[PDB]
Symmetry: D2
Subunit: 416 residues, 4 copies
């Protein structure tokens, strides 16, 4: 395709409804000059981004997408079998038990920058195998047992691991691996303040914006309409690294710490001002929260929507607290539905996969180690599995689940 | 430390009780010429082997070690916290969800040969973090709240991924990562159509190559010889006269020779591998007591006290029969037969995959937070009384430890 | 695309000239059932295959492709700049200084099976960068200074590291990483007893088939090179294949291997058996011998006229006339690297340090500039200017 | 070993000559509390650190150590056979052709942080193999042909890839892989170059020293300053920098400073008490410029080890070109190195070879450019002529032999 042809096709694409309300501080010619003469296709990223966009605009089963953090390809596989519509890939879970340094870390961006994309690839590879198994058995799209295994993957890009070029390279790796959406945040975890009423440190609004622009540019160069999730940690961060951006002057207290940080007035107002600033550069806005407060959620949503009506929002929980300690059972039950009616169409439990995994190993192990080992394995795992069969669980047939049937057909064809 | 002194040491070490009944077809001098002038220490491998040996000879709580396959450092950590004494690292689980090709594979040796070792390192790194957290908090060995995190790791080396040098290099990767014990099998999974065995002498050479690597590194790693002869009715060649009684003479189109699958063949291989390994294992698909008693009696008629290992996948609805009473005492009856190391190979993957399915099937339907509270958070809070500490997730992964490191540096 | 539709597109493509004379023991239907509902695009593999084919059928500059083994993306970069048309990726070099076990090994298939594909990926990434630098600076295709950086990569899959499924997975890795051609051999390197050991003919054929099936499943027309080590191997693992009976003496070794009559006659029967399943046939050799080369070629062409051959290295022109259209020195990259490092360091260690660096490297680099060598400007070569543009665009 | 014994041994060790002039803002008890009850041995790191220290204190052949940037284990191997006493591992070379993202990058800390440590491991493994070959052939320390393959490795940690914890973890990976020395800098390539406040740069040097102490290995720490060409600084939080801070702030919010040898010297003097070596990065080779820095450093810290580099992006009179490294040695620059020697050697020669080869009469140029010169060099110690042996074919043949009885 000629350069001029590529420029014209982009200019036209940015007029499409997918890009309504999105701001780009660069031109189509800027994008096309960074591509090179050959631009490799990223099939899974293309499919994931398209699918995610549709689910967020009327095709989800419940009107909203609710996800659970997953740290292995196999956890994501079971989610797809259970009916989950999008996979959430948590950086925290990766730091603790699935990173490339092969170490257990706390959530402070200590792992090698290419660790999340590595997990994205594992998940997509698992999805491909399942799809192959299914296709080779002749079960085709639109069959009474046809499971669509390619769930869009939402991945945690932390703060980009450095400057704008670092965020640019990480975005590229996420896309090449097949992620459907990526989230960037405005706190600098690498410099969290120690001691004295310390905590998370924000970067100036402008710096956080350049990272979103860096991720959008990389996406545009590759030609995939990847969803960009702008996250703000300003609700709880009362420290900023600098006062260079006039937009933040109203939250700057004047006091300075020994590191050179400037104190700010933390709270929903600062969160709202970050939310509004990132809105035109992202497809989804997320305001990090630590408590299940429906009223605060409404307020945050109303504020963003007064300026950007219909803007898509995301809502999380780790969860770090005891929901039952904070709320009554009926509110716990209708929590996600209420959020959805406020505009939170993407909701998730960030650490569900690790809590699920670690707790169940502990539970089985604890009984097993005391004796009567096989009875515990039978009562805690096998019996529950047989009962789950009715619901779509097929791992009871463990050889087939991992491709044994698929590879047998390969073998038979080769020696055919 | 010089060559002669190294030679002298080895010779003396081999007269120690650890090596009783063990045959090595080479010399101490052969071992030392393969070492180099500098031989890096393997602290974790050393500690795990010595501990694993002690547990198998009287220091285990129940008289036997019962394990569960783990595929993440975190699963292992929870086992350590629950009182498990050794970690079993299954090749099947790695092929399915934790290998270096980042792909889901069936159990046919398709993943890159350095994958199990990578998981060993992950596990030991998880244990190193837990131990540091504990130590930083002032809790030391002897202290009643001290938890010994360095559980010996038993790893799956399949058939070595090639010839003797491949097996030699794999053993080496295993030891440098810190495995305490390693198992090698006599089937050739790269051709599973049923299972296919290699000649008895070929299997023995792989065991020899593994033992040689360990002696070169200088670590007493435990070697587990596994035989798949109970289910293998094919052999690659008739070159070994030891195998002639099971070879009928019939050859298949692939050039393989038919044999007679059964405990008789299993017994023959077990007897041949015995003098070369610390433990002997006859892989089974059916957890069957009479079969197990028959195998152990056979081995023990010839090598009294030989330590055995027993596994189960286990197969679907296997308990479908044995009465509940046989199911509950199953592991104790085995221990009395000599099976001191028992393990459920796919426990970890079943545990993980099923629970994710269970949580997600309910959550995808609605009332999402209720299901999370009822299936996870509530049960977690109730297990805190038993030693589960992940209820406080930030402390578990080292936030407190690293915050302290930051503090020492800043001030 | 529909299953049936996919099946039809496959039947039709197998009638095209690209596949004349190639045998496939399976059906299109078989191929399609293994694909899945989604088959990711492999852009670089497609381009590499299409280009390697065209170069072998009239578009090379000299009527033949001569390559040099490369072990780093940078080495490949310099080759592209100097005018080479195809990159040769040696497994021996990978085993010695570029494998995923991070160790130095002899050539005995000791390294992790995904190691070669990892280097294929590095080379392709280096090429993408050079291309981006050139494109971002305006130089477009057809420019009097435009260098086509996407050189087809020929990579060594050894014996596929195990059975038919491992070869299948290895081929998949090669293709996903962007290889244009891959070679499989009939010796079992993991068993070189204290010479070479061949596997029955049917076994080597099963691997060629597995390799071709994966390429067909991916939809990429990757070139498959069948290599035979039978010219020097006098040992075989088994006598199960009737086709090999005439070379088998009956003598058997302590390992249970059968002695065979090695020589060109053994190489010719393997060459002939593999011909229909491969795009190129290669009978590995150690010394340049035109008469031997002429004999192997006449024997293959008597049954498969036109069959392209590969030649492990006016010498070159006659070979080319005989059909040896792909010629290469497998270990050039490592000899080039280690020798020059030794040269430079030997002198440097003695004294007059900067003088030796200037005469052995700087001066010569300067003279090189006139021939298309651009690394004298190393900040630019590595993309400092490309990322400068990225930065500039993001910040305004 | 007891917590108490550990603290005690640690204290006595800090009074040893290895540590004179070095400041540690933390106590022995702090170190031991971060260790864990089991502390795995780091054999290669111990050997390389001890050896590097000895070389720098009289045991080198020429009075100074001159190195060349290497990016593959094989390149290091040839340096060992060539007489080089220390291996230099450049981050620039790693960015361009040997990083874990498998991509070619400019030198702006864009590659995965565990990339350099991965190359350290490759180099040490190659050395292990070369040593095994030798030992298995009966050759031992003292044999007229015995080569000491374990050269200390000097490795580039750039700026630690983040905050103090990233720097801590990076150092941990360098030591576990077996590096003998590591360099950290005060610029922010992630951001001409921008410097960080002096206290921050120092915090990274302490983070690295702390990890080494916890591991129990006396690793060498090289403090590098980029202040000779840096006119920007991220903040004015450190009074120690106040005199170079002009007052004019940039649009990014960075502050302008007065760049020059005077800036480098103050960074140089501020890092001295925390590093084992001090290095003031340089673009142009000026002896006088190098003399002022050295003298200036020594006024306050007599006999402080200094390091000096050459890209050389340059284009170097012949007499001064030939005595250059001899003169620096006299100023106190005991560790000298050509950072990109490795990549230019490799890339240029492949260009030279391929260029000739592509034209025609290929076999001819290969023989003339590589093979003939290799035979000629065998005389001087080059052994790759016998390539099967160099990589261990003979060592693995012995293994096979012992195994099959
Ligand atoms: Hg892509
Ligand atoms: Hg603090
Ligand atoms: Hg990009
Ligand atoms: Hg600013
Ligand atoms: Hg919020
Ligand atoms: Hg939530
Ligand atoms: Hg070790
Ligand atoms: Hg070893
Ligand atoms: Hg035999
Ligand atoms: Hg059995
Ligand atoms: Hg069992
Ligand atoms: Hg692909
Ligand atoms: Hg394939
Ligand atoms: Hg056969
Ligand atoms: Hg030949
Ligand atoms: Hg040649
Ligand atoms: Hg270590
Ligand atoms: Hg450390
Ligand atoms: Hg400061
Ligand atoms: Hg300087
Ligand atoms: Hg220099
Ligand atoms: Mg996160
Ligand atoms: Mg297994
Ligand atoms: Mg090869
Ligand atoms: Mg550097």
């Amino acid at each position: 395709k000629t350069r001029t042809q590529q420029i014209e096709e982009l200019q036209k694409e940015w007029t499409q409804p997918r890009w309504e309300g999105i701001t780009r501080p660069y031109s189509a010619e800027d994008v096309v000059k960074l591509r090179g003469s050959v631009n490799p296709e990223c099939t899974l990223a293309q499919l994931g981004a398209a699918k995610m966009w549709r689910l967020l605009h009327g095709e989800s089963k419940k009107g909203y997408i609710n996800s659970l953090g997953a740290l292995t390809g196999g956890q994501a596989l079971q989610q797809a079998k259970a009916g989950i519509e999008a996979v959430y890939l948590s950086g925290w879970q990766v730091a603790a038990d699935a990173n490339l340094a092969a170490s257990m870390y706390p959530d402070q961006s200590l792992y090698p920058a290419n660790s999340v994309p590595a997990v994205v690839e594992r998940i997509n590879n698992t999805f491909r195998r399942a799809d192959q198994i299914q296709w080779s058995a002749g079960i085709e799209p639109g069959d009474p047992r046809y499971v669509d295994y390619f769930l869009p993957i939402v991945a945690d890009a932390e703060a980009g691991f450095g400057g704008v070029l670092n965020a640019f390279e990480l975005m590229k790796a996420m896309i090449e691996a097949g992620a459907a959406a990526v989230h960037f945040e405005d706190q600098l975890a690498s410099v969290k303040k120690c001691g004295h009423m310390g905590g998370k440190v924000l970067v100036p609004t402008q710096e956080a914006i350049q990272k979103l622009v860096a991720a959008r540019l990389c996406a545009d160069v590759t030609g995939v309409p990847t969803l960009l999730v702008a996250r703000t940690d300003a609700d709880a961060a009362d420290l900023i690294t600098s006062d260079c951006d006039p937009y933040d002057s109203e939250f700057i207290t004047g006091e300075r710490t020994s590191e050179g940080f400037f104190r700010t007035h933390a709270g929903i107002e600062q969160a709202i001002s970050r939310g509004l600033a990132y809105a035109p550069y992202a497809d989804l806005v997320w305001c990090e929260t630590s408590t299940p407060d429906l009223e605060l959620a409404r307020r945050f949503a109303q504020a963003i929507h007064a300026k950007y009506p219909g803007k898509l929002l995301a809502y999380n929980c780790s969860p770090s607290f005891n929901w039952q300690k904070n709320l009554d059972d009926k509110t716990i039950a209708s929590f996600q539905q209420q959020l959805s009616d406020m505009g939170y169409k993407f909701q998730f439990i960030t650490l569900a996969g690790i809590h699920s995994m670690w707790f169940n190993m502990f539970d089985l192990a604890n009984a097993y180690a005391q004796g009567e080992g096989m009875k515990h394995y039978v009562e805690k795992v096998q019996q529950p599995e047989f009962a789950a069969a009715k619901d779509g669980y097929t791992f009871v047939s463990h050889q087939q689940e991992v491709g044994t049937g698929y590879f047998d057909k390969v073998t038979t064809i080769i020696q055919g």
